Design a protein around this ligand. Structure first.
Ligand SMILES: NC(=O)c1ccc[n+]([C@@H]2O[C@H](COP(=O)([O-])OP(=O)(O)OC[C@H]3O[C@@H](n4cnc5c(N)ncnc54)[C@H](O)[C@@H]3O)[C@@H](O)[C@H]2O)c1
Ligand SMILES: NC(=O)c1ccc[n+]([C@@H]2O[C@H](COP(=O)([O-])OP(=O)(O)OC[C@H]3O[C@@H](n4cnc5c(N)ncnc54)[C@H](O)[C@@H]3O)[C@@H](O)[C@H]2O)c1
Lengths: 334, 334
């Protein structure tokens, strides 16, 4: 289903408005959903709109709610989202971390009682766009089992690291090798994962999507390494925001809400000259892209670089959304 | 062979002093090399000493040199190691970060022209002991090919994240799923890796150490995830310190020296109560350890919790050092 930027935002807008969302907030929120899609992140863009709505109706989200600063230690700041909209509040918090970084060289915002921020890379991206290094992450509900377990007790806690290079180099990864969304994609397509992305009932690694989708034994990136990183990122987000951990949000809440997020912005230009920054960054990037390829036809790519090409493509060949997804959106009307 | 702490530290100090190292710094360095070894880290403790001394004699390391601060923006500072001792300087720099966080909430020190810091986890650990969150990483020579390549163009750039929990929770991990050191351990014992750790000559994943140690096609942790992470960690350390990147160090230097490192400390106690900190942190660790196991008799390990028993065991049955390694150290005094 081929659509337009305005059409997407239009839908997102009216749907929100009819759900007790003030036009202003609705528009702002609808804007981000449309932007995330046009950038190529449909999974957390148009595709996540439906699930985002139901949670709103469930009261997990409060459109009229707004962030509030609790404590200030200088370069670091603890805030309280107060169950506000995920993407909107996160975008503001990263902007805040940038302000703090502007006068401190580096800034950090710990957010508690927050909602799912959709695409994490959005916040790292808006920072890298301003010449700052961007680093952020959040915790979530227990959707993955720690290394050595068969029960889900840790979250996907995605880590984002964006660098103000040209083009922007950014890492936006789940702690789980594959996201449950990619599993469905492969399952529906009838293909298996390129690499082991889970465990079957016998406890053996597998590439079979369906098996993992059922037992929830999704494989952590780097096995024990991803598992470990997930836990430490949960502790840091929990501690600095004095908020809810993966355990708390899972065992105490009715769904995935009230999570904890971290936002970091780091000054760059006041530490390294423009010409030097470009030369040093360029040498790194070319050192990677000029390496002897494993597959000559397949060129080596840098992290996040696709978000620049994908965007350009949609702004030319138009945006295309999954029929089953679009059809669902239309349903939300009337 | 068994050796007492002081007997071990004496062998280090003796060699250090015989290599022109200052009496005070010598004792300081030997101390770290000993403590690291007593913590159960031999690969980067006593077994790396010979290599250390070799780079020292080659001029790579300047025992005299001391860290020189360059620029200060507030909570972030850029320092120049000036080819000083790796572990001794890294310790001071993390102490400077802890010093900055104490008054700004969060501190970061970007260091250029540094030397191998031995055990990265040492610094994250030292921060956590002070009650601060410890995060640090360094770059290295290109010893691993970026995802999609067969030629080494990226470094192992280890990321350390330590939490002031009880016990201290910490992830000290390289960006390579396995370290070349571990590949040798298995190969020598005719053992296959527990999980894929590299590619063969035909570009296929393999658990065969030998072939990997030969083509240097070591596998990045989490495939493209680790490869991407290594690249962004290198960019950050290079930019904030305006220092050498993996590419620069590998081609502009005669050996592994003049690398870039990042040291970060974040205060916790001023954002959360001691009891609330112990409770929330315990609820996280318990949520992990109480997970249904894949093997009923195999406990779920939390990252870094093995360093408490390794230390205790060594501080009761004496330290066990490889005999050939001990003789190689002694031989340096010949
Ligand atoms: N709870 C949450 O908030 C949550 C949880 C899981 C995932 N997510 C989001 O879902 C999205 C996808 O996450 P993912 O982990 O599946 O991402 P992914 O594996 O597709 O990519 C992770 C990173 O690796 C890079 N990459 C991918 N293929 C590459 C290749 N062939 N060569 C070089 N680099 C490559 C990408 O640019 C990216 O930065 C992200 O936006 C993530 O934030 C959110
Ligand atoms: N350039 C450098 O200076 C450099 C380069 C490479 C490695 N190193 C060092 O070598 C050492 C080893 O690194 P590595 O990546 O090979 O480590 P590793 O894979 O052995 O461990 C990484 C992490 O996973 C955890 N872990 C291991 N097994 C686990 C299990 N079964 N369950 C749960 N958690 C588990 C550990 O506690 C640790 O925090 C580190 O001290 C690292 O800093 C340094």
């Amino acid at each position: 289903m081929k659509v337009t930027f305005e059409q997407l935002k239009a839908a997102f807008n009216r749907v929100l408005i009819s759900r007790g969302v003030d036009s202003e907030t609705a528009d702002a929120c609808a804007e981000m959903f449309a932007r995330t899609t046009e950038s190529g992140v449909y999974s957390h863009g148009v595709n996540r709109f439906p699930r985002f709505i139901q949670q709103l109706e469930n009261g997990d989200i409060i459109p009229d709610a707004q962030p509030k600063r609790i404590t200030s230690l200088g370069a670091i700041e603890q805030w309280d989202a107060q169950r506000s909209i995920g993407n909107l509040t996160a975008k503001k918090m990263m902007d805040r971390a940038i302000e703090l970084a502007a006068d401190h060289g580096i800034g950090l915002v710990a957010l508690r009682n927050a909602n799912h921020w959709m695409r994490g890379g959005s916040y790292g991206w808006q920072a890298a766009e301003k010449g700052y290094i961007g680093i952020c992450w959040t915790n979530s509900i227990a959707v993955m089992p720690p290394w050595g377990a068969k029960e889900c007790r840790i979250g996907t806690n995605p880590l984002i690291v964006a660098i103000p290079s040209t083009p922007i180099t950014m890492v936006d990864m789940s702690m789980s090798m594959f996201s449950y969304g990619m599993l469905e994609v492969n399952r529906l397509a009838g293909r298996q994962l390129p690499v082991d992305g889970g465990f079957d009932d016998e406890g053996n690694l597998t590439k079979e999507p369906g098996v993992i989708e059922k037992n929830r034994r999704i494989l952590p990136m780097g096995y024990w390494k991803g598992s470990g990183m997930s836990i430490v990122l949960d502790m840091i987000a929990t501690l600095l925001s004095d908020g809810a951990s993966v355990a708390e949000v899972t065992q105490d809440n009715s769904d995935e809400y009230g999570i904890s997020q971290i936002f970091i912005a780091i000054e760059v230009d006041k530490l390294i000259d423009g010409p030097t920054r470009d030369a040093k960054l360029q040498r790194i990037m070319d050192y990677v892209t000029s390496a002897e390829r494993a597959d000559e036809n397949q060129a080596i790519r840098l992290p996040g670089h696709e978000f620049t090409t994908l965007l350009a493509e949609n702004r030319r060949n138009g945006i295309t959304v999954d029929d089953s997804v679009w059809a669902k959106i239309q349903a939300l009307l009337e």
